Design a protein around this ligand. Structure first.
Ligand SMILES: CCCCCCCCCCCCC/C=C/[C@H](O)[C@H](N)CO
Lengths: 41, 284, 243, 243
């Protein structure tokens, strides 16, 4: 968490991201489907 | 009172996930109407059948790490992007900064369409027999539009405005940081378009796919001396992607590579993605 | 209540009775450019009825030995309608789309299509040269309303395999389940506005994975029609016409 | 919401999309033996995953002139899996079952099966002797996994007519309506525990009442598979192996 320059891009790697959001790639549909039901009815 | 019709969200939700997912215990299902095994792949969605609804599972408190798989820890590993050959006795050498020429780091970067990163270059300069001779070098950075040097002792090496690095061969290798220098808001590796207007030809249009938002300049190198010393050099440039953001994933390359700027392949020799076996009805 | 749908945009409407679902590309809706992301200093035009409507292209006959097809968007609509006239008088361009591929077949036919949307779909050349080198013609890269057939659909004509091409927004047209695929796509580009003549953003692709088979006596002519529609389209930089 | 079902027991699961309903035999669920009805003084073993799962038997081809079939339970599972090893090391035995008979056919086929469950199904001999007398062989009474075809399905090979055999727990497999029959059976015996080698409790029976008919050109091979599963099984009296 240290930097010796005033330029913010000369620093090391920043804090960890820890998030992911897979619902935009796995299930990108309008009618949200459940698990325990038939997807086509 | 006036004309009325002049008066007249998303789906995904990100969660901070630390470790891998757990498993809750299950039981047996003996009932009709509720089925988790039947899917429909035509809806464009993936299957959502979890393993608690297929079999009977136990309670597992999972403590595995999902840290090294992020896009920062995946790209912050410096690899070779260019080799500059300098034979002294024109006296200098240039290198158009294009990292699409070496294939270890190219294929990692072709997973995505748009990337926004900072870089961290490193220049490992040796002789042709191994290195370590006490001569002094100069590495200029020539932005697009700046005059490239035209001689071993020309006036463009005065370097009053653009950056430069003086380092000997016997020092540790020089290392700088480079910001996001594109005029757009992301480096795009695939540009389906033409740079200029006009009538585009049918035979050989060498401008299809040229993205001028990625051309970042020229890297020049000489030996800081008056009389021409006689020693052959090679530099090796190592780029480390840091502070990196990526958009719009795409499939990974499966065909062998051909040109730097163009995604060519040969159609007469298309390599299959899966190596062959004897028949379909046996596994080994 | 899920197989029946109607899509009214502008003065046009599409009904369907054997649909599957509707896919939003990457979970987002097409919208106008906000003020915190705009870089031009002129006021844009927003026609909003005359350019946001379902344009129906021509039909592609699907046969036994079809190797597949691709269009470029917004290349196919630069010469049709008032969208084709606003995209020539104006230098800048921004829109979304709403795609719909119709293909019906009886209860005795079989096969499957892959209808996907590929952002920045760059066509590759087909030579074993390491520099001169072969490059695709202008009617191959920017085909227009007549599309273009693939030469090598296994690698999508870009050295990139079809088996992983389900990472893009897509649906399937399985002839025993549905007859239509609908994909709604936002504006995906690295700049807020860009030209509609040089740069085509993405490319619709329909490739038959499992081939069309039918017993003798059935109807032999199975066409594939494609009906597309811009959404939230706006233009800028008025000048004279350049096609 | 009634034609679609899934049955997950153990590590195995059965899906169906054209079912009818699920029948509990005599309105009761298989359970463990209570302490007020137990007569042994040892502790029983209850594996509960390794023995409660769907075992799939072999397939029976159904033809024009089939006179029908019968298995004995738990005879068919004394040699398959860990249920077949717990039923040999242990003298005592108690379980329920969950049966499932799959038989699919197209929209141009016709016929009907009768899938019933007969407690204490005793095979009769076929002679006009009043004492010597004919008695059925051991592979006819206790057939195993390969079953046995009826000789006289009209009297169920026991002098007892089929027309009244709907008093047992049963379903129908009518090829225009469904394709599978499911019967869940508790433990029905006069003693709390009994041996699994000498005494088979009940017998599953599949008899085609209306015959299989199909027009020319259709698929001629219609198989009948049977997938059964023990439920709430427990054993007692450990000793050496007797088959
Ligand atoms: C004395 C320091 C000289 C070295 C400084 C180099 C700065 C220029 C680096 C710009 C950022 C990386 C260049 C762009 C990346 C890819 O090669 C291009 N996008 C090619 O498509």
């Amino acid at each position: 968490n240290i930097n010796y320059y005033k330029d913010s891009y000369a620093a090391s790697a920043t804090r960890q991201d820890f998030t992911q959001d897979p619902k935009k790639f796995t299930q990108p549909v309008l009618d949200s489907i459940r698990e325990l039901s038939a997807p086509l009815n | 009172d006036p004309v009325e019709d002049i008066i007249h969200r998303a789906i995904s939700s990100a969660t901070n996930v630390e470790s891998a997912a757990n498993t809750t215990p299950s039981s047996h299902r003996l009932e009709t109407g509720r089925v988790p095994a039947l899917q429909a792949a035509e809806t464009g969605a993936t299957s959502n059948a979890t393993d608690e609804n297929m079999i009977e599972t136990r309670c597992v408190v999972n403590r595995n790490g999902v840290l090294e798989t992020t896009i920062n820890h995946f790209f912050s590993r410096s690899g070779l992007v260019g080799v500059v050959n300098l034979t002294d006795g024109t006296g200098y050498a240039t290198w158009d900064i294009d990292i699409m020429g070496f294939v270890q780091l190219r294929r990692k970067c072709e997973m995505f369409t748009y990337m926004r990163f900072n870089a961290e270059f490193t220049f490992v300069t040796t002789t042709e027999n191994g290195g370590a001779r006490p001569y002094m070098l100069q590495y200029m950075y020539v932005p697009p539009g700046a005059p490239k040097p035209t001689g071993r002792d020309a006036f463009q090496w005065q370097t009053a405005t653009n950056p430069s690095v003086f380092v000997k061969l016997t020092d540790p290798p020089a290392q700088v940081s480079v910001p996001f220098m594109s005029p757009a808001s992301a480096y795009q590796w695939f540009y389906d378009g033409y740079p200029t207007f006009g009538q585009h030809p049918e035979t050989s249009n060498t401008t299809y796919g040229l993205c001028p938002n990625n051309m970042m300049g020229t890297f020049a190198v000489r030996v800081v001396s008056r009389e021409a010393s006689q020693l052959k050099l090679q530099t090796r440039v190592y780029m480390k992607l840091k502070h990196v953001r990526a958009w719009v994933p795409r499939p990974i390359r499966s065909q062998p590579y051909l040109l730097k700027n163009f995604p060519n392949y040969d159609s007469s020799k298309i390599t299959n993605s899966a190596r062959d076996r004897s028949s379909i009805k046996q596994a080994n | 209540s899920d197989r029946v749908a109607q899509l009214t945009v502008g003065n046009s409407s599409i009904t369907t009775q054997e649909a599957a679902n509707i896919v939003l590309a990457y979970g987002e809706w097409p919208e106008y450019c906000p003020d915190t992301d705009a870089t031009a200093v002129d006021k844009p035009t927003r026609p909003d009825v005359s350019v946001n409507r379902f344009y129906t292209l021509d039909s592609k006959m699907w046969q036994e030995n079809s190797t597949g097809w691709y269009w470029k968007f917004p290349d196919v609509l630069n010469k049709t309608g008032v969208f084709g006239q606003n995209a020539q008088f104006h230098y800048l361009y921004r829109s979304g789309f709403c795609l719909h591929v119709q293909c019906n077949a009886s209860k005795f036919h079989q096969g499957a299509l892959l209808v996907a949307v590929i952002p920045e779909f760059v066509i590759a050349g087909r030579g074993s040269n390491t520099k001169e080198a072969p490059h695709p013609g202008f009617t191959t890269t920017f085909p227009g309303t007549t599309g273009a057939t693939f030469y090598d659909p296994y690698v999508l004509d870009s050295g990139v395999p079809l088996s992983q091409a389900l990472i893009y927004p897509h649906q399937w047209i399985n002839l025993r389940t549905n007859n239509c695929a609908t994909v709604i796509v936002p504006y995906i580009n690295a700049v807020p506005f860009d030209s509609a003549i040089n740069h085509s953003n993405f490319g619709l692709i329909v490739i038959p994975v499992s081939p069309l088979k039918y017993s003798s006596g059935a109807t032999t002519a199975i066409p594939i029609t494609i009906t597309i529609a811009p959404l939230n389209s706006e233009f800028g930089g008025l000048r004279q016409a350049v096609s």
